[PDB]
Amino acid sequence: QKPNIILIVADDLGYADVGFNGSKDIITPNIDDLAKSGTSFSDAYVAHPFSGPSRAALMTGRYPHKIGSQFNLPTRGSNVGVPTDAKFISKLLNENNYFTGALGKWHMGDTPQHHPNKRGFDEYYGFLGGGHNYFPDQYQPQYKKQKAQGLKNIFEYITPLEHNGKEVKETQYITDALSREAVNFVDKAVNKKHPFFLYLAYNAPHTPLQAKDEDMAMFPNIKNKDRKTYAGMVYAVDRGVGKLVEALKKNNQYDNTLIVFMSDNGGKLSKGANNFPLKAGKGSTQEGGFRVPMLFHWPKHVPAGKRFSHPVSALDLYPTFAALAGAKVEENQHLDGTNMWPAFIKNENPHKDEPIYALRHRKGYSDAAIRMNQWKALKVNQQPWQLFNIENDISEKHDVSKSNKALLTDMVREMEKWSWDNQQPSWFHETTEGVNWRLDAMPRFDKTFKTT
Amino acid sequence: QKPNIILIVADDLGYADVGFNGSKDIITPNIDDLAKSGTSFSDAYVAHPFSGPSRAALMTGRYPHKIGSQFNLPTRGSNVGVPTDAKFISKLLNENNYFTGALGKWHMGDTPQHHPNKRGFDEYYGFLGGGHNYFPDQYQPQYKKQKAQGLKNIFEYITPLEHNGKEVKETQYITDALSREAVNFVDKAVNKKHPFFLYLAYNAPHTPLQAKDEDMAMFPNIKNKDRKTYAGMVYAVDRGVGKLVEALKKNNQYDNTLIVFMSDNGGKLSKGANNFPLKAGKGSTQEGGFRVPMLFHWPKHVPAGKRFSHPVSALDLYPTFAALAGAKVEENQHLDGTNMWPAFIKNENPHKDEPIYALRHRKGYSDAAIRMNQWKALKVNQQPWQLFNIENDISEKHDVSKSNKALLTDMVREMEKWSWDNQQPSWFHETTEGVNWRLDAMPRFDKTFKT
Amino acid sequence: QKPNIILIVADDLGYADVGFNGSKDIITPNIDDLAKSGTSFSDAYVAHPFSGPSRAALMTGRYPHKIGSQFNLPTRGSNVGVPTDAKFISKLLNENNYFTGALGKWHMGDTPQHHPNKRGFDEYYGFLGGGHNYFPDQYQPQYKKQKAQGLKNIFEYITPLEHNGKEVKETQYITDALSREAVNFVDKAVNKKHPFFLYLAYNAPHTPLQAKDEDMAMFPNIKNKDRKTYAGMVYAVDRGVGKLVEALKKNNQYDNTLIVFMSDNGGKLSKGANNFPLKAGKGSTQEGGFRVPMLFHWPKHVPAGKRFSHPVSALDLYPTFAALAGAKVEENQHLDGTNMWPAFIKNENPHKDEPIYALRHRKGYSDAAIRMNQWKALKVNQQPWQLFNIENDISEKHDVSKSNKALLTDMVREMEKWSWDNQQPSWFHETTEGVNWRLDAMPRFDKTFKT
Ligand SMILES: O=S(=O)(O)O[C@@H]1[C@H](O[C@H]2O[C@@H]3CO[C@H]([C@H]2O)[C@H]3O[C@@H]2O[C@H](CO)[C@H](OS(=O)(=O)O)[C@H](O[C@H]3O[C@@H]4CO[C@@H]([C@H]4O[C@@H]4O[C@H](CO)[C@H](OS(=O)(=O)O)[C@H](O[C@H]5O[C@@H]6CO[C@@H]([C@H]6O)[C@H]5O)[C@H]4O)[C@H]3OS(=O)(=O)O)[C@H]2O)[C@@H](O)[C@H](O)O[C@@H]1CO
Ligand SMILES: O=S(=O)(O)O[C@@H]1[C@H](O[C@H]2O[C@@H]3CO[C@H]([C@H]2O)[C@H]3O[C@@H]2O[C@H](CO)[C@H](OS(=O)(=O)O)[C@H](O[C@H]3O[C@@H]4CO[C@@H]([C@H]4O[C@@H]4O[C@H](CO)[C@H](OS(=O)(=O)O)[C@H](O[C@H]5O[C@@H]6CO[C@@H]([C@H]6O)[C@H]5O)[C@H]4O)[C@H]3OS(=O)(=O)O)[C@H]2O)[C@@H](O)[C@H](O)O[C@@H]1CO
Ligand SMILES: O=S(=O)(O)O[C@@H]1[C@H](O[C@H]2O[C@@H]3CO[C@H]([C@H]2O)[C@H]3O[C@@H]2O[C@H](CO)[C@H](OS(=O)(=O)O)[C@H](O[C@H]3O[C@@H]4CO[C@@H]([C@H]4O[C@@H]4O[C@H](CO)[C@H](OS(=O)(=O)O)[C@H](O[C@H]5O[C@@H]6CO[C@@H]([C@H]6O)[C@H]5O)[C@H]4O)[C@H]3OS(=O)(=O)O)[C@H]2O)[C@@H](O)[C@H](O)O[C@@H]1CO
Ligand SMILES: O=S(=O)(O)O[C@@H]1[C@H](O)[C@@H](O)[C@H](O[C@@H]2[C@@H]3OC[C@H]2O[C@H](O[C@@H]2[C@@H](O)[C@H](O[C@@H]4[C@@H]5OC[C@H]4O[C@H](O)[C@@H]5O)O[C@H](CO)[C@@H]2OS(=O)(=O)O)[C@@H]3OS(=O)(=O)O)O[C@@H]1CO
Ligand SMILES: O=S(=O)(O)O[C@@H]1[C@H](O[C@H]2O[C@@H]3CO[C@@H]([C@H]3O)[C@H]2OS(=O)(=O)O)[C@@H](O)[C@H](O)O[C@@H]1CO
Ligand SMILES: NC(=[NH2+])NCCC[C@H](N)C(=O)O
Ligand SMILES: NC(=[NH2+])NCCC[C@H](N)C(=O)O
Ligand SMILES: [Ca+2]
Ligand SMILES: [Ca+2]
Ligand SMILES: [Ca+2]
């Protein structure tokens, strides 16, 4: 019996904003249940410190730089997306007999060939862009007004949600709507004589900061307005996870389902998040930007009550899911992660003596990160490379590059070696960003990989 | 019975240079016959305001920017062309049982894999470059002299014409030569138990301005030397269309043949053309550069004596021809036009609430055009975006952008959205053009899509 | 019986550094034997004036610019290589029943899909980078020390050699080691009922200048330290050729084996080489950079004791080997050389009225070369195009461009035409080189093909 698989991804969820990863103010009982009876991950890294490229990496199992997807898609819409020649984990599972669903945020291409239904998902219910307004009673009138005015380029956050290409009129708070459709999906899966894969991509707690009064009422001792709204938004996700878990139990799916819960990137401190004890947040190559909460839950397979301390990459989920599903991986797919399960089961480092990378572009330069065993190499703000023993110095306070010159230089040269098959970006999130890229002769890797 | 299809394209034909589209001085009786007994199009647009990219769009059904073909091919020759992975309308029809011919101007690649015979044409008779000298007695001696001198890079306008890869020695005025081969092609098609597709690409009335004395004699009241030569050149095309039509009738092909006649782009005013009432001409994103004459003729299918007033794109011919031929279109072909026939038959707009675009690059900036319902948005000469109600203001005289700020902004943002899958050009028409493109960080779409 | 084929390539071997090509000080008796009983080539050209692109051209039969391989691979390692869609001569021969081996220097990609065993070589014994230190007793302790320190990016010149993906511990001087494995390969080939192809890629006489005392002792009258070391290194290659030849004779393979011996590029004057009488050396588009020593040896087929005076390209070896092996070449492979054997046998020019090109990129500009019949067109150091009658002026002393303006202009325009399907480089040898390429809007072919 092949297991069902559920990948739950929250959007801009801060490192300290779920109870199992150290939250003292936001309360996440249903998510914490999964942690307490499963394994959480203290050194879990996404492939990029923001949404689009991170999500591309999750789906393809490749660093987004390898497939021209290093930037978020154009904010006002486009006819491009994550390239079709990189087989999504969903398509691979669908080809090995899985019933497949995707819910909520896509952020990987609007067009027919980039649509969830052509990337291997039998079901899709959600919004295709970078986010969405949370209240239908707020957004539907705005959209109606603009459509009646003849406007064709409407802010994607107020546009109707869809189900398999057909527009719907959603009635509920979006987090709750997506949770309801998660229940509907796993309910539909009972009647199929097949295992299922569900990709549940919540837009919470991403902007705009919009919560239900009923969820905000549960945090009366949180005085800061943004933090209370944010706390409410996260609580809605927790309620949703509970509702999904309950449906899995009723359907007798729970015991044979691997649930993964994570964030797509680090939390944004100016929009209510907390990343303690990590430095900085969303978009950074500091730990706060791409080190995220993660838990696995699968009874009698994932040990209960444990805390896994070795590095794990979002890139690992593609080959790890494939191995558990009995799906063959071809070498021409160029997967950048590893099947982490053998090493996971022995409590060993699945990236022993192997680097994990982050490379985020800016105007005329790039910030970078290398995580390798106990070492974190850091390139930020055009300053020289820094080195931290991240196991003793999680907050990146003590640069020890002066005492380890050869090691750091070696780590950077390996990243330079790794960079040669990075593709030129196929798009940018804004027109001026792409113009500046060309004006500045990017990538300026002569600056990025300069050593000592 | 699947219909035969003939696409006749003239080269630099001005908007007012055929009788059915308002010519008062050039006379085009045989072309006008097709219009009078068919439907002409008052709002017909090509995909680019000059040859190579326009022709690539006709053949592929894709905006040339999508396939790296936004510029004319190198003037002195090259080993590149319209990419082989974009299936030509000719190949699609050939795969669905059509006998296929192409005549005259190619301008889409010289090399073996870019040659007409590898792009789905059973027959090809013509010249592969951007144009040709019209008189064999003039050009053949020039070529002979240069070949005997050992020169290998010879101006493509004097090089021998070819038939399916073998050089020929043409004897007649080129317009007449191509017309004769159109007759030969449809004559050969009688013996095949198949429908046929013919792509007749005349180089007239493109430069050099060379006409027969016999055709120029028919316009004694045209005093301007260039305009008289030009008029003659166009008259030769009209004679040719007549000869082709006559052959179709004799062969019992005429009633089951859809004939399309059009220009590849707007006329060039400094080389004898007239684009009245449109502003500017060849190469412009003003209407004069990419709005062209067009007619459909197909008895008992295309209504006789009509004038279709809704926008139509050259891009529409690919899926429209395919639907009529019963040829399936796969979604991975990424076609940018639409099958216009359903909407055409109901006299409705086949691009209702959908834009038609032109984007022509220049040195360090781009000019652009958007046609959407009654609206023409215009970006020219690095000035701010202008808006015209093109149905009331065909000559683009009255900028009404100040009264419609939100609408214009919306139209431009949609074009910006559309631009993201434009590919970097695979070539340029001159080396310095490509160098300047790279020096200037092109495309400078930050300037093109501002406000 | 299809013939066996051996391609022996030395690395940075100067033009005057083998006896048969005019050496007065370095003595190469075994290599000279092959010349004296075969044919040498006075006008043999590689496709690029340095290693990686030259080697890519040898293997693919294509100019390296056509396949994005105009630069050496990154010096400190990479996950890229000569593209997999360009079938190597080794794979073609392997598919037509040949037992295939490659020895020594690769310099065409480290990764699994770029590895010799996936590019059609049954056997590989060597080092995958741009070169190697010659003494195991010197390099193995350095590598051991650095590996134990935890370093993962180790200079490729001290890393272990490998045999079919498994690391080895080599005991001998590398030139001798590779010669020993050439003997082993042709010995293994006796037991196979198949012809064999062997690609023997010596790193000698490339840096570092490291020779055995026993080889240096043979040149007591060479006073210059570098020249003596270099002479020794070359003598080691000669000993190796002798050892291979002896094995071929013992195995009765010699008479049915075409042996080719050549250099990958011109010699480097600052590292012991001599290119007399050619101007300049390694990396240049002067003759000294890409005109190399070459000989063919094949008893009763290649005439004995001859000197072939017509141009021949490294690109020719792909289709020439294929024709002799009875292996079919598909037109979709886009081969840039020619099967030179028919013309070779008649003592005619296999590139009669056809150019041979060199195009080497630099910081913000490109140097170029055109060889066509008796003519050498030269573009160097950003100076204007020069023309030489290279048959009368091998040392490029007398620029005769003023007396042949039309001819030169024609040659350059043809090269400009040829350049349009050059691909943007897929990598560079250093990060700064790639940055400078983008900063300078390269290629600056406006400068390269001016006038
Ligand atoms: O009703 S309103 O909200 O008022 O108006 C809206 C709309 O605004 C909203 O749009 C979305 C939804 O909520 C907010 C709000 O502003 C906004 O949130 C954005 O959502 C995105 C997804 O839709 C995305 O989130 S993600 O998907 O999880 O990734 C956005 O995050 C990203 O934003 C950029 C793209 O990647 C990152 C960001 O990169 C920035 O790019 C800038 C250039 O454009 C700049 O780069 S640089 O110039 O090349 O250097 C910037 O760096 C700079 O930042 C400041 C300024 O200068 C310095 C520094 O001091 C420089 O470093 C760079 O960060 C990614 O964010 S990340 O945190 O960096 O990882 C997310 O913000 C309006 O947009 C619209 O006009 O109107 C509607 C109403 O109609
Ligand atoms: O024997 S001779 O005729 O005396 O000499 C010939 C030959 O000349 C001829 O070559 C052809 C045949 O007749 C004429 C003649 O000059 C010429 O006509 C050209 O035919 C082409 C096809 O072969 C093509 O027509 S098309 O196939 O229908 O498209 C040509 O039109 C195009 O020309 C350019 C390429 O696309 C468009 C043009 O783009 C121009 O490019 C310029 C850069 O090189 C420049 O761009 S910019 O530098 O980025 O700004 C230019 O813009 C500028 O132009 C002037 C100068 O400054 C302003 C403006 O005032 C600036 O805007 C840009 O337009 C397309 O033209 S379009 O009208 O824009 O659509 C067609 O001209 C000689 O060439 C040869 O050397 O010798 C032989 C005899 O041996
Ligand atoms: O122990 S040490 O030896 O001291 O140190 C070593 C190691 O150094 C060695 O590494 C190898 C082995 O011996 C030497 C030594 O320095 C070096 O040799 C090089 O081997 C390569 C293969 O491994 C390759 O040979 S080849 O495979 O046969 O091709 C090298 O030749 C090439 O080198 C460059 C790449 O292609 C050619 C060269 O191109 C150069 O590119 C430069 C940078 O971009 C520059 O280009 S430009 O700026 O754009 O114009 C350069 O031109 C310039 O050079 C100077 C400066 O400005 C002018 C000029 O005055 C400008 O023209 C251009 O040549 C090809 O050479 S070619 O001759 O041009 O064809 C071969 O040299 C160290 O590297 C390591 O770190 O340490 C170890 C010890 O630990
Ligand atoms: O760059 S160069 O130094 O190499 O050349 C320079 C200059 O830089 C170029 O910009 C310039 O280019 C013009 C245009 O293309 C080629 C050249 O002439 C073209 O027009 C000619 C036209 O003059 C000619 O007319 C002659 C004339 O009347 C009829 C005809 O024959 C008679 O004998 C008489 O002399 O006809 C040509 C076609 O046969 C051609 O006209 S056309 O084909 O373009 O319609 C172009 O001029 S244009 O862009 O103004 O139209 O050349 C100079 C070198 O002089
Ligand atoms: O969705 S939010 O970004 O959290 O907040 C917005 C709005 O702030 C925005 O207003 C414009 C558009 O982008 C920025 C600004 O230039 C953004 O502010 S910023 O992130 O601080 O730079 C906020 O003013 C309003 O109250 O709420 C909306 C969301 O509903
Ligand atoms: N159980 C293990 N695999 N431990 C080693 C993992 C790497 C470890 N962080 C180190 O100090 O090198
Ligand atoms: N004028 C001449 N063609 N001289 C002889 C040149 C010889 C040259 N190798 C050729 O093949 O042509
Ligand atoms: Ca996010
Ligand atoms: Ca034209
Ligand atoms: Ca070399």
Side-chain angles (χ1 to χ4, degrees), chain C residues 184-187 189-192 194-200:
Chain C
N184 294 345
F185 178 82
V186 301
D187 286 350
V190 169
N191 296 322
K192 314 283 179 170
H194 298 340
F196 67 87
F197 170 67
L198 176 62
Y199 176 54
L200 173 55

Side-chain angles (χ1 to χ4, degrees), chain B residues 11-12 50-51 55 105 206 264-265 282:
Chain B
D11 188 350
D12 291 357
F50 61 77
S51 177
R55 291 155 192 279
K105 181 167 163 174
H206 189 284
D264 70 339
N265 53 247
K282 191 187 175 180

Side-chain angles (χ1 to χ4, degrees), chain A residues 31-35 37-90 92-96:
Chain A
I31 292 164
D32 288 2
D33 280 344
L34 294 172
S37 74
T39 299
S40 65
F41 291 84
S42 50
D43 301 65
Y45 293 96
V46 287
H48 200 75
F50 61 77
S51 177
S54 181
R55 291 155 192 279
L58 279 164
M59 287 296 103
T60 62
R62 321 235 274 127
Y63 279 106
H65 322 71
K66 308 306 182 196
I67 55 170
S69 313
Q70 306 92 320
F71 290 89
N72 284 343
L73 286 159
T75 60
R76 300 196 282 241
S78 71
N79 23 26
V80 297
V82 171
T84 55
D85 68 3
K87 187 172 282 182
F88 276 30
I89 186 56
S90 47
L92 185 69
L93 294 173
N94 195 83
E95 289 164 357
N96 296 258

Side-chain angles (χ1 to χ4, degrees), chain B residues 87-90 92-96 98-109 111-141 143 146 148-165 167-187 189-192 194-222 224 226-242 244-327 329 332-345 347-351 353-362 364-369:
Chain B
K87 187 172 282 183
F88 276 30
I89 186 58
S90 47
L92 185 69
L93 293 173
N94 195 83
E95 289 164 357
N96 296 258
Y98 278 60
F99 179 51
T100 55
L103 300 169
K105 181 167 163 174
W106 187 238
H107 212 200
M108 292 177 292
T111 73
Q113 290 195 12
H114 296 291
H115 192 277
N117 293 319
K118 301 297 177 165
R119 310 313 300 258
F121 288 109
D122 298 312
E123 286 290 316
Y124 175 68
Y125 188 108
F127 40 93
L128 296 166
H132 214 279
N133 285 15
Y134 293 80
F135 286 110
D137 60 296
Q138 268 153 75
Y139 72 73
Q140 289 167 350
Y143 175 77
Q146 289 179 47
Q149 193 178 337
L151 298 168
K152 305 202 91 210
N153 194 267
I154 301 162
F155 181 40
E156 65 193 358
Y157 279 57
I158 72 177
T159 54
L161 276 64
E162 63 160 77
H163 176 221
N164 296 346
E167 293 179 152
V168 297
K169 188 185 174 153
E170 183 47 67
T171 56
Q172 302 188 248
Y173 181 73
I174 291 297
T175 307
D176 300 337
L178 297 172
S179 308
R180 163 203 80 212
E181 295 301 334
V183 170
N184 294 346
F185 178 81
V186 301
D187 286 350
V190 167
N191 298 321
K192 314 282 181 192
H194 295 281
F196 67 87
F197 170 67
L198 176 61
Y199 177 54
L200 173 54
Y202 286 109
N203 60 314
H206 189 284
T207 55
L209 297 179
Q210 298 179 339
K212 298 169 78 187
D213 286 338
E214 298 79 3
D215 295 327
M216 292 193 279
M218 308 310 298
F219 306 101
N221 300 130
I222 303 183
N224 187 276
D226 284 2
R227 182 62 178 178
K228 195 208 280 288
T229 311
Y230 177 100
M233 293 168 87
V234 174
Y235 187 67
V237 177
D238 197 81
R239 287 190 295 87
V241 169
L244 173 54
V245 163
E246 180 201 286
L248 293 170
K249 289 172 171 185
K250 284 200 278 182
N251 298 164
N252 182 238
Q253 298 165 319
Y254 184 70
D255 285 348
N256 201 44
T257 299
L258 171 60
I259 305 173
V260 179
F261 178 87
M262 69 193 297
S263 191
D264 70 339
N265 53 247
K268 181 158 181 164
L269 300 188
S270 69
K271 302 296 172 181
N274 176 17
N275 295 317
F276 179 90
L278 314 180
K279 217 187 143 165
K282 191 187 175 180
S284 179
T285 61
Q286 304 275 357
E287 292 297 83
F290 76 111
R291 187 163 171 174
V292 298
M294 190 171 71
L295 75 87
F296 282 15
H297 187 273
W298 187 16
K300 307 184 163 208
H301 299 90
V302 175
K306 306 302 186 208
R307 182 74 176 177
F308 193 79
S309 70
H310 304 291
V312 175
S313 172
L315 299 165
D316 303 339
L317 301 183
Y318 193 115
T320 303
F321 291 172
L324 298 171
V329 176
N332 75 308
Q333 290 188 274
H334 304 297
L335 300 188
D336 290 321
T338 193
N339 175 6
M340 52 70 82
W341 199 263
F344 178 65
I345 292 292
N347 202 13
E348 291 175 338
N349 188 349
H351 300 269
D353 306 336
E354 301 295 358
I356 279 166
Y357 292 118
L359 180 69
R360 180 261 164 79
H361 299 304
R362 295 193 182 278
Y365 72 96
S366 307
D367 288 336

Side-chain angles (χ1 to χ4, degrees), chain A residues 47-90 92-96 98-112 114-117 119-141 143 146 148-151 153-165 167-187 189-190 192 194-222 224 226-242 244-249 251-299 301-305 307-327 329 332-336:
Chain A
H48 200 75
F50 61 77
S51 177
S54 181
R55 291 155 192 279
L58 279 164
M59 287 296 103
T60 62
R62 321 235 274 127
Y63 279 106
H65 322 71
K66 308 306 182 196
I67 55 170
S69 313
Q70 306 92 320
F71 290 89
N72 284 343
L73 286 159
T75 60
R76 300 196 282 241
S78 71
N79 23 26
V80 297
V82 171
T84 55
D85 68 3
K87 187 172 282 182
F88 276 30
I89 186 56
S90 47
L92 185 69
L93 294 173
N94 195 83
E95 289 164 357
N96 296 258
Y98 278 60
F99 179 51
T100 55
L103 300 169
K105 182 166 163 175
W106 187 238
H107 212 200
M108 292 178 291
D110 305 337
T111 72
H114 296 291
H115 192 277
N117 293 129
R119 310 314 300 259
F121 288 109
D122 298 312
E123 286 290 316
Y124 176 68
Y125 189 107
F127 41 93
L128 296 167
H132 214 280
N133 285 14
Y134 292 81
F135 287 109
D137 288 352
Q138 186 265 76
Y139 72 72
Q140 290 168 349
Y143 175 77
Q146 289 179 47
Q149 283 182 40
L151 299 168
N153 193 267
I154 300 163
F155 182 40
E156 65 190 359
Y157 279 56
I158 72 177
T159 55
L161 276 64
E162 62 159 77
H163 176 220
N164 296 347
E167 292 174 139
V168 298
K169 187 179 176 142
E170 182 49 66
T171 56
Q172 301 189 249
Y173 181 74
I174 291 298
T175 307
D176 301 337
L178 298 171
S179 308
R180 168 233 308 147
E181 295 301 335
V183 170
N184 293 346
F185 178 82
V186 301
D187 286 350
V190 169
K192 315 282 183 169
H194 296 139
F196 67 87
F197 170 67
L198 175 64
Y199 176 54
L200 173 55
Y202 286 109
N203 60 313
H206 189 284
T207 55
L209 296 182
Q210 298 179 339
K212 298 168 76 187
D213 286 336
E214 298 83 354
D215 295 327
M216 291 194 275
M218 308 313 297
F219 305 101
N221 300 330
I222 304 182
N224 188 277
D226 285 1
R227 185 61 176 179
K228 195 208 280 288
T229 311
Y230 179 98
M233 291 168 87
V234 173
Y235 187 64
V237 178
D238 197 81
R239 286 189 295 88
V241 169
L244 174 54
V245 164
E246 183 40 69
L248 293 170
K249 289 174 169 197
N251 299 163
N252 299 117
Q253 297 166 318
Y254 184 70
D255 285 348
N256 201 44
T257 300
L258 170 61
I259 306 176
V260 178
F261 178 87
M262 69 192 299
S263 190
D264 69 339
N265 53 247
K268 182 158 183 168
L269 298 189
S270 70
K271 302 297 170 182
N274 177 17
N275 295 318
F276 179 90
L278 314 180
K279 217 188 146 163
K282 190 187 175 180
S284 181
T285 61
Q286 304 275 357
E287 292 297 83
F290 76 111
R291 188 163 170 174
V292 299
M294 190 170 71
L295 75 86
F296 282 15
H297 187 273
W298 187 16
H301 300 90
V302 175
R307 182 73 176 179
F308 194 80
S309 70
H310 304 291
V312 175
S313 170
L315 299 165
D316 302 339
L317 301 182
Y318 193 116
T320 303
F321 291 172
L324 297 171
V329 176
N332 75 308
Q333 290 189 274
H334 304 297
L335 300 189
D336 290 322

Side-chain angles (χ1 to χ4, degrees), chain A residues 74 76 79 153 431 438, chain B residues 410 414 416-418 421 441 443:
Chain A
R76 300 196 282 241
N79 23 26
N153 193 267
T431 291
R438 291 183 292 278
Chain B
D410 193 60
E414 285 293 279
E416 185 180 41
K417 157 176 185 190
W418 168 90
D421 67 337

Side-chain angles (χ1 to χ4, degrees), chain C residues 69-75 77-78 80-87:
Chain C
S69 313
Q70 306 91 322
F71 290 90
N72 285 342
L73 287 157
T75 60
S78 70
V80 294
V82 171
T84 56
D85 69 2
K87 186 173 280 183

